[PDB]
RNA sequence: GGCCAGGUAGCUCAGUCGGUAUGAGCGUCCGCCUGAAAAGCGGAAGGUCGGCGGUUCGAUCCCGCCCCUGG
């Protein structure tokens, strides 16, 4: 939760788990463990309060870019799965009305 | 018989239909039905709305 | 806007001039006012106080410092040789002021017993009271300071303050503006109690002041609708004079704060006679006073130092320098009376009621004057109200009334303000009331309210008084006779209502649908026409969807919900969320109401004159300019459709439950419907049926789209149905069943079809080929096992054959079955199961 | 129309004026448990702190406008 090495590691761990999720239920689990309050990227923003005041502006900027990276990958993945779901409800759940 | 520009009509706060001065609104009472019945039906009228 | 407050003592005094000794209990007075048509909103008695509550004078003030707030140790003269030391926290009084003191042992409104206290390191021997503590007024910031000379130290506080009085809060109807004063209300009580009334605005009570010349140059544009404009000056008033306590108290009990004599007298006279008055500083008037319409873009700063944007329909008072007043609403700060004012020019004017109403409503100024002018003010009492002000102001403030007067009364001058006479049969009130009133009752009552009555055989000629412009037709006169005689004397007889036709077919069907859905487990709600904010965005509808063409409300109670409902589902889904969010997760709702579906932009129709019946073309035009409002039946379901119990775990809601809701409505309407697959938001496109009565679409039903459920916070698997009842024709079938006494033949037929083939289409094909021998057909199996090819399904129907005139053989029945299979092969490509 | 106080989880409400609301009670989910339940015990999920912008590396918190309340 310090150097960009620790940030890029958590982003890649969050990004590959986001690309692995194929259902909306699985992506909800990834959102909890990689973007929720108990996620590595969230703990990095929590450690910005215990950092010296002269270092909050520099280190806090590197956290925002890393969080936006995993957040952007989540939104595009959520839209992709929602698009697939909307395009599959007609056939995969069709009934004789 | 509502007087225009009068507290008997202006103080009757009404849901007016947009835009302003459209002369169209949500009815504050079912009394306009009694006007429609008098115009439509023949006398005598014994009606409930 | 219609509130009128006045103390009973003042009302009794005006009534007692012509009815010496008149006095009634506040309870009886309220019933009398209610019986003649005056709503009494509240009866507020003053006080009560008990024990030593006396008038005192502050003889010295010691400022106690070092505390959280400024505190005063006061020596108060209560009328004896021993001054009382009283601790008070208020700061709105000085040495020499008259105050009201509650001494130890006194009781204040609310059981507040007063005793000596040890406050702020000092010994307080009572308290100095505020208006709120004495239940005299609402002022609680400071304590009550009586004006000088109001009483001497030692006078009984309750007597000086008049705490035995009672304040009446009245809601005056907009047709009785004359009752916005003690004059009109006293007159009403004189009518109700058959008393002699002495008009407080008459010349005997307000003798005319001298008229020796014009008081001020005046130009009046008669197009402004002004009926009268009178001016009289009062010169040499004392800037140090204050209004006496009897005048400040009556203003207080009427809800008006006292300021200075010049303004206090104008407010007092307005309350007494109903004619709004205004006082100008004559030394701040520059040249000729002009009454004219405001020009385009003209502005003015009013009494309260606020600039107003004026309209060309606003009537103004201006001079050569600036604007002096907004006619009938509020005066301007330019000619406003100030503390140093010594020469006052009093304004007594009658403005156009409609002009004042438009101006005060556009500018949001419901002043005491405006809400009286918009209800018509008696134009005959202008100079009387003017002379009442000038005489009272000169007496109080030590001024002198100038014998000059300007009195504009129109071109040509109007010297008689009598409304047009009204002709009415003497027994017209008797016919409408259904009561045979005593002889001469109509003429006596109409004379009581001030009208001139002359007899012409059986026809009365009634000229209403100038303060009753609401009396225009005989019906207005009938109300006056009936309300004064009392509506309790009217008997109760049922009218001769003719042979009616009862409920229509549509009203009867609306009941049968409600009974059927309720008996099937649905709970009715009352849907709201205001759509939720962005409901169609949650549904994902296209921008050209006809449901988006909504009628919008200009002044909704929630600015984010202005649009009227084009569909009943948003209201039902809102009630569905309310139930599920509160622990009731197994719910089935329905609603039967109208929608608002405009076919064009909001187009209004000009005013048709109401002195005639609108033509049939004018009635059709008013209907076409309105949006289409058909009647819909809709329903929503979520959670369990059938609850759990000792029979099993229950069954969750599925799309077939919404389909059955359609057939429940169809059976209640006695129509036959068909369900066809369709794509239509917000429904699930694979679980959505379009409902048809014949070949006309009447609505949709099925499960909602899962994305709509997610974006709307709905329960998973929520189903819905909405039908257009106006699109379903009312049917009156007359069946003639012929029961055949011959036995039936039972056979089952198993057909294999493509998966996309609807089961109903297979049954229709089987029915068409079987012929008249087919008595009943029922699907009871749909099999898609391994022995059935992919994208195919096996359907097995239970057939029942019966002839009307003979007993069949199995070969006879099999002939109809084989003919049904051939029809199924030709129409849906069915293959006999093998 | 005023300066204020408010809008916070599915319900009813606490609490924060810059980097975690360790939010509570109840509601939801999992485990032990029961034939299946509930309680109990042990674990979890869920708020984008009213909306739209601005300031800032970063806003539930600061500034503006607006929606809906209480006084
Ligand atoms: Mg009433
Ligand atoms: Mg009347
Ligand atoms: Mg809530
Ligand atoms: Mg449990």
Tab-separated table of C-alpha atoms in Angstrom, chain C residues 248-523:
chain	number	residue	atom	x	y	z
C	248	UNK	CA	-52.790	50.251	20.362
C	249	UNK	CA	-54.583	47.402	22.148
C	250	UNK	CA	-57.403	47.059	19.607
C	251	UNK	CA	-54.810	47.002	16.825
C	252	UNK	CA	-52.872	44.350	18.758
C	253	UNK	CA	-55.906	42.118	19.319
C	254	UNK	CA	-56.656	42.466	15.586
C	255	UNK	CA	-53.124	41.380	14.657
C	256	UNK	CA	-51.607	44.751	13.701
C	257	UNK	CA	-48.513	46.231	15.336
C	258	UNK	CA	-48.661	49.852	16.442
C	259	UNK	CA	-46.011	52.138	14.961
C	260	UNK	CA	-46.955	55.831	14.954
C	261	UNK	CA	-50.283	57.689	15.272
C	262	UNK	CA	-50.534	58.514	11.554
C	263	UNK	CA	-50.284	54.854	10.528
C	264	UNK	CA	-52.129	53.521	13.588
C	265	UNK	CA	-55.197	55.636	12.798
C	266	UNK	CA	-55.299	54.488	9.164
C	267	UNK	CA	-55.145	50.847	10.269
C	268	UNK	CA	-57.699	51.399	13.043
C	269	UNK	CA	-60.213	53.071	10.720
C	270	UNK	CA	-59.731	50.303	8.150
C	271	UNK	CA	-60.563	47.703	10.798
C	272	UNK	CA	-63.535	49.747	12.006
C	273	UNK	CA	-65.179	50.654	8.690
C	274	UNK	CA	-63.556	48.356	6.114
C	275	UNK	CA	-62.131	51.167	3.982
C	276	UNK	CA	-58.330	50.889	3.652
C	277	UNK	CA	-56.609	54.185	4.416
C	278	UNK	CA	-53.072	55.416	3.824
C	279	UNK	CA	-51.106	58.378	5.169
C	280	UNK	CA	-48.538	60.260	3.091
C	281	UNK	CA	-45.947	62.760	4.250
C	282	UNK	CA	-47.239	65.778	2.336
C	283	UNK	CA	-43.856	67.529	2.554
C	284	UNK	CA	-42.370	64.657	0.506
C	285	UNK	CA	-44.886	65.010	-2.353
C	286	UNK	CA	-43.477	66.761	-5.432
C	287	UNK	CA	-46.184	68.331	-7.573
C	288	UNK	CA	-49.431	66.905	-8.923
C	289	UNK	CA	-50.497	63.431	-7.815
C	290	UNK	CA	-51.325	61.230	-10.788
C	291	UNK	CA	-53.334	58.005	-11.005
C	292	UNK	CA	-52.386	56.114	-14.161
C	293	UNK	CA	-51.435	52.700	-15.470
C	294	UNK	CA	-47.777	51.807	-15.094
C	295	UNK	CA	-45.740	51.904	-18.285
C	296	UNK	CA	-43.817	48.983	-19.754
C	297	UNK	CA	-40.782	48.193	-17.625
C	298	UNK	CA	-41.646	50.747	-14.939
C	299	UNK	CA	-40.608	49.976	-11.360
C	300	UNK	CA	-41.124	51.356	-7.863
C	301	UNK	CA	-39.826	50.819	-4.327
C	302	UNK	CA	-42.627	50.078	-1.873
C	303	UNK	CA	-43.102	50.831	1.836
C	304	UNK	CA	-40.795	47.957	2.836
C	305	UNK	CA	-37.891	49.229	0.720
C	306	UNK	CA	-38.266	46.509	-1.931
C	307	UNK	CA	-38.273	47.255	-5.655
C	308	UNK	CA	-41.130	45.821	-7.718
C	309	UNK	CA	-41.362	45.135	-11.446
C	310	UNK	CA	-44.655	46.645	-12.592
C	311	UNK	CA	-47.053	45.665	-15.369
C	312	UNK	CA	-49.039	47.870	-17.730
C	313	UNK	CA	-52.150	46.566	-15.926
C	314	UNK	CA	-50.963	47.920	-12.558
C	315	UNK	CA	-52.537	51.137	-11.265
C	316	UNK	CA	-50.053	53.596	-9.763
C	317	UNK	CA	-50.003	56.795	-7.730
C	318	UNK	CA	-47.127	59.011	-8.883
C	319	UNK	CA	-46.101	62.650	-8.675
C	320	UNK	CA	-43.486	64.691	-10.545
C	321	UNK	CA	-40.541	63.022	-8.755
C	322	UNK	CA	-41.252	59.313	-8.197
C	323	UNK	CA	-44.001	56.761	-7.570
C	324	UNK	CA	-45.998	57.298	-4.381
C	325	UNK	CA	-47.912	54.012	-4.102
C	326	UNK	CA	-48.947	50.804	-5.818
C	327	UNK	CA	-52.685	51.473	-6.070
C	328	UNK	CA	-54.547	49.444	-3.467
C	329	UNK	CA	-51.601	47.220	-2.519
C	330	UNK	CA	-48.960	49.215	-0.648
C	331	UNK	CA	-47.550	52.724	-0.599
C	332	UNK	CA	-44.031	53.637	-1.631
C	333	UNK	CA	-41.196	54.637	0.679
C	334	UNK	CA	-40.892	58.012	-1.080
C	335	UNK	CA	-44.017	59.574	0.466
C	336	UNK	CA	-43.954	57.200	3.452
C	337	UNK	CA	-44.695	58.662	6.881
C	338	UNK	CA	-41.505	58.915	8.948
C	339	UNK	CA	-40.679	59.807	12.544
C	340	UNK	CA	-40.116	63.480	11.656
C	341	UNK	CA	-43.373	63.800	9.694
C	342	UNK	CA	-45.425	66.846	10.706
C	343	UNK	CA	-47.907	67.321	7.821
C	344	UNK	CA	-49.911	64.327	6.589
C	345	UNK	CA	-52.078	63.951	3.475
C	346	UNK	CA	-54.537	61.083	3.937
C	347	UNK	CA	-55.489	58.877	0.982
C	348	UNK	CA	-59.002	57.393	0.741
C	349	UNK	CA	-59.362	55.596	-2.596
C	350	UNK	CA	-61.488	52.854	-4.160
C	351	UNK	CA	-59.565	50.675	-6.611
C	352	UNK	CA	-60.725	48.145	-9.174
C	353	UNK	CA	-61.026	44.757	-7.411
C	354	UNK	CA	-59.768	42.709	-10.365
C	355	UNK	CA	-56.845	45.072	-10.998
C	356	UNK	CA	-55.699	44.850	-7.371
C	357	UNK	CA	-56.125	41.063	-7.368
C	358	UNK	CA	-53.904	40.579	-10.424
C	359	UNK	CA	-51.258	42.960	-9.073
C	360	UNK	CA	-51.066	41.676	-5.493
C	361	UNK	CA	-50.973	38.056	-6.692
C	362	UNK	CA	-48.302	38.713	-9.328
C	363	UNK	CA	-46.193	40.585	-6.754
C	364	UNK	CA	-47.049	38.287	-3.797
C	365	UNK	CA	-48.361	41.099	-1.573
C	366	UNK	CA	-51.520	39.999	0.297
C	367	UNK	CA	-51.660	43.146	2.416
C	368	UNK	CA	-54.571	44.138	4.644
C	369	UNK	CA	-55.611	46.731	2.059
C	370	UNK	CA	-55.287	44.522	-1.028
C	371	UNK	CA	-57.320	41.587	0.287
C	372	UNK	CA	-60.101	44.082	1.071
C	373	UNK	CA	-59.993	45.938	-2.257
C	374	UNK	CA	-60.073	42.671	-4.219
C	375	UNK	CA	-63.280	41.791	-2.329
C	376	UNK	CA	-64.820	45.207	-3.213
C	377	UNK	CA	-64.762	48.111	-0.734
C	378	UNK	CA	-67.873	50.265	-0.194
C	379	UNK	CA	-67.257	53.354	-2.374
C	380	UNK	CA	-69.851	55.449	-0.516
C	381	UNK	CA	-67.900	55.707	2.761
C	382	UNK	CA	-64.629	57.100	1.352
C	383	UNK	CA	-64.968	60.659	2.665
C	384	UNK	CA	-66.521	59.318	5.879
C	385	UNK	CA	-63.510	57.062	6.453
C	386	UNK	CA	-61.305	59.989	5.413
C	387	UNK	CA	-62.897	62.372	7.924
C	388	UNK	CA	-62.736	59.679	10.615
C	389	UNK	CA	-58.967	59.447	10.104
C	390	UNK	CA	-58.325	63.195	9.997
C	391	UNK	CA	-60.344	63.920	13.144
C	392	UNK	CA	-58.794	61.039	15.093
C	393	UNK	CA	-55.218	61.763	13.986
C	394	UNK	CA	-55.436	65.480	14.792
C	395	UNK	CA	-56.829	64.659	18.243
C	396	UNK	CA	-54.174	62.070	19.121
C	397	UNK	CA	-51.068	63.669	17.584
C	398	UNK	CA	-52.014	67.259	18.447
C	399	UNK	CA	-52.516	68.196	14.805
C	400	UNK	CA	-55.069	70.345	13.015
C	401	UNK	CA	-57.487	69.282	10.283
C	402	UNK	CA	-57.283	71.393	7.148
C	403	UNK	CA	-60.724	72.332	5.763
C	404	UNK	CA	-59.603	71.366	2.248
C	405	UNK	CA	-60.746	68.237	0.425
C	406	UNK	CA	-60.195	66.636	-2.968
C	407	UNK	CA	-62.874	64.063	-3.859
C	408	UNK	CA	-62.664	62.623	-7.372
C	409	UNK	CA	-65.767	60.557	-8.155
C	410	UNK	CA	-65.482	59.910	-11.902
C	411	UNK	CA	-66.384	61.729	-15.105
C	412	UNK	CA	-69.137	62.784	-14.641
C	413	UNK	CA	-69.005	62.722	-10.814
C	414	UNK	CA	-71.031	59.891	-9.295
C	415	UNK	CA	-73.254	61.137	-6.460
C	416	UNK	CA	-75.206	57.891	-5.949
C	417	UNK	CA	-73.461	54.518	-5.585
C	418	UNK	CA	-76.643	52.430	-5.633
C	419	UNK	CA	-76.405	49.129	-7.556
C	420	UNK	CA	-79.091	48.362	-10.156
C	421	UNK	CA	-82.461	47.396	-8.664
C	422	UNK	CA	-83.526	43.753	-8.658
C	423	UNK	CA	-87.043	42.466	-9.321
C	424	UNK	CA	-88.182	39.355	-7.452
C	425	UNK	CA	-91.503	37.792	-6.545
C	426	UNK	CA	-92.409	38.215	-2.889
C	427	UNK	CA	-92.699	34.432	-2.440
C	428	UNK	CA	-89.524	33.463	-4.343
C	429	UNK	CA	-87.594	32.834	-1.076
C	430	UNK	CA	-90.565	30.766	0.120
C	431	UNK	CA	-90.449	28.502	-2.944
C	432	UNK	CA	-86.699	27.839	-2.871
C	433	UNK	CA	-86.645	27.302	0.897
C	434	UNK	CA	-89.734	25.102	0.751
C	435	UNK	CA	-91.085	27.020	3.761
C	436	UNK	CA	-94.141	29.273	3.994
C	437	UNK	CA	-92.467	32.217	5.690
C	438	UNK	CA	-94.665	34.685	7.607
C	439	UNK	CA	-96.082	37.671	5.757
C	440	UNK	CA	-93.526	40.380	5.032
C	441	UNK	CA	-90.521	38.263	6.029
C	442	UNK	CA	-88.676	38.698	2.721
C	443	UNK	CA	-89.084	42.483	2.685
C	444	UNK	CA	-88.095	42.797	6.352
C	445	UNK	CA	-84.913	40.734	6.004
C	446	UNK	CA	-83.851	42.524	2.814
C	447	UNK	CA	-84.411	45.865	4.549
C	448	UNK	CA	-82.277	44.672	7.477
C	449	UNK	CA	-79.229	44.072	5.259
C	450	UNK	CA	-79.538	47.648	3.963
C	451	UNK	CA	-81.542	47.279	0.744
C	452	UNK	CA	-84.344	49.550	-0.452
C	453	UNK	CA	-87.556	47.553	-0.926
C	454	UNK	CA	-90.670	48.712	-2.780
C	455	UNK	CA	-93.820	46.673	-3.364
C	456	UNK	CA	-95.608	46.307	-6.725
C	457	UNK	CA	-98.450	43.887	-6.039
C	458	UNK	CA	-96.529	40.626	-5.678
C	459	UNK	CA	-93.228	41.757	-7.246
C	460	UNK	CA	-90.579	43.331	-5.022
C	461	UNK	CA	-88.115	45.895	-6.373
C	462	UNK	CA	-84.948	45.589	-4.282
C	463	UNK	CA	-81.966	47.936	-4.541
C	464	UNK	CA	-79.056	46.445	-2.548
C	465	UNK	CA	-76.754	48.746	-0.567
C	466	UNK	CA	-73.426	49.943	-1.919
C	467	UNK	CA	-71.483	47.646	0.442
C	468	UNK	CA	-73.204	44.543	-1.017
C	469	UNK	CA	-72.076	44.205	-4.655
C	470	UNK	CA	-72.580	40.435	-4.311
C	471	UNK	CA	-76.367	40.994	-4.514
C	472	UNK	CA	-76.938	40.862	-8.271
C	473	UNK	CA	-79.760	38.345	-8.890
C	474	UNK	CA	-82.863	37.146	-7.020
C	475	UNK	CA	-80.913	34.062	-5.908
C	476	UNK	CA	-78.528	36.332	-3.990
C	477	UNK	CA	-81.554	37.847	-2.249
C	478	UNK	CA	-82.922	34.365	-1.496
C	479	UNK	CA	-79.730	33.461	0.372
C	480	UNK	CA	-80.065	36.566	2.554
C	481	UNK	CA	-83.629	35.677	3.561
C	482	UNK	CA	-82.848	32.002	4.153
C	483	UNK	CA	-79.633	32.443	6.149
C	484	UNK	CA	-81.129	35.058	8.488
C	485	UNK	CA	-84.295	33.013	9.038
C	486	UNK	CA	-82.077	29.980	9.655
C	487	UNK	CA	-81.550	26.920	7.469
C	488	UNK	CA	-82.801	24.711	10.324
C	489	UNK	CA	-86.435	25.587	9.515
C	490	UNK	CA	-86.174	24.007	6.051
C	491	UNK	CA	-88.014	20.642	6.050
C	492	UNK	CA	-86.667	17.313	4.766
C	493	UNK	CA	-88.671	15.879	1.853
C	494	UNK	CA	-87.317	13.388	-0.663
C	495	UNK	CA	-87.507	14.526	-4.306
C	496	UNK	CA	-89.462	12.760	-7.092
C	497	UNK	CA	-86.546	11.037	-8.792
C	498	UNK	CA	-87.793	9.237	-11.934
C	499	UNK	CA	-87.334	5.616	-13.021
C	500	UNK	CA	-83.587	5.375	-13.595
C	501	UNK	CA	-81.696	2.878	-15.724
C	502	UNK	CA	-79.196	1.839	-13.048
C	503	UNK	CA	-75.579	0.948	-13.683
C	504	UNK	CA	-74.209	0.960	-17.212
C	505	UNK	CA	-72.568	-2.126	-18.689
C	506	UNK	CA	-69.123	-0.583	-18.231
C	507	UNK	CA	-69.728	0.371	-14.604
C	508	UNK	CA	-71.090	-3.119	-13.917
C	509	UNK	CA	-68.081	-4.760	-15.583
C	510	UNK	CA	-65.695	-2.592	-13.550
C	511	UNK	CA	-67.195	-4.085	-10.384
C	512	UNK	CA	-67.090	-7.679	-11.646
C	513	UNK	CA	-63.404	-7.308	-12.536
C	514	UNK	CA	-62.621	-5.959	-9.070
C	515	UNK	CA	-64.519	-8.743	-7.308
C	516	UNK	CA	-62.814	-11.402	-9.436
C	517	UNK	CA	-59.251	-10.166	-8.910
C	518	UNK	CA	-59.837	-9.675	-5.180
C	519	UNK	CA	-61.288	-13.180	-4.849
C	520	UNK	CA	-58.199	-14.493	-6.681
C	521	UNK	CA	-55.781	-12.936	-4.176
C	522	UNK	CA	-55.147	-9.414	-5.485
C	523	UNK	CA	-55.243	-6.284	-3.315
